[PDB]
Amino acid sequence: GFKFVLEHDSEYQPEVKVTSYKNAIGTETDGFDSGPVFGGGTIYNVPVSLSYDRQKVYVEMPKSYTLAGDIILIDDGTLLVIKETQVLCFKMSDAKITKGYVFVA
């Protein structure tokens, strides 16, 4: 989204880095290695504004980056939002994401 929440296991304020890319492995329309650039297209560093509560990171991004699709939690410090060929990647250092969702006021 614009404002996305990441729940985590740290008692601190882990750094979060957001990336945007198209056609990553298994997101291609016509299956594996069917896209124009194997492995994914241009990776864009998403500018973020970070805010912290106990075990919660509030990630603010420009509106153009809003993408609600499938919220996929990867067993390490990574959450993905996948909408067909498009991916919004959230990478957390020094902690593990336990839950992720668009900020509901």
Partner 1 sequence: ASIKKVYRGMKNGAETINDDLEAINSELTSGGNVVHKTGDETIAGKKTFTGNVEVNGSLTLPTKSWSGELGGGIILSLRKKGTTVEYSIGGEISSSILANSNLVNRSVPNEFCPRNRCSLVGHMVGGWNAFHIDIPSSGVCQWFGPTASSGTPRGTGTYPIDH
Per partner kind, with CB cut-offs from 5 to 8 A, the member of its own copies, Br ion, partner 1, none near residue 49 is its own copies
Closest to Br ion by CB, 1 or 41: 41
Q: Which residue has the tokens 């996305």?
A: 4
Q: Which of 12, 15, 68, 101 binds partner 1 (CB under 8 A)?
A: 12
Size of the site for its own copies (CB under 8 A): 15
Residues 6+ positions from 14 with CB-CB distance below 8 Å = 8, 57, 77, 92, 93, 94, 95
**Span of 23-31, 47-55, 64-72, 81-89 interacting with its own copies by CB under 8 A:** 47-55
